[PDB]
Amino acid sequence: SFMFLITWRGYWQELIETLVWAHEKTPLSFGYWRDKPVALSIVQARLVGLTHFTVGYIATYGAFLIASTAGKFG
Encoded one letter per residue, x for contact with another protein by CB under 8 A and - for no contact, window 26-65 reads: xxxxxxxxxxx-xx-xx------x----------------
Handedness of CA 52, 57, 60, 63 (dihedral sign): negative
Q: Where are the alpha helices (DSSP H) in the chain?
A: 2-6, 9-25, 42-70
> Interface with another protein includes 71 (CB under 8 A)?
no
Q: What is the DSSP letter of 27?
A: T
Residues near ligand CLA, by CB under 6 A? 2-3, 6-7
Among positions 3, 42, 50, 59, the unique one binding ligand SF4 when judged by CB under 6 A: 42
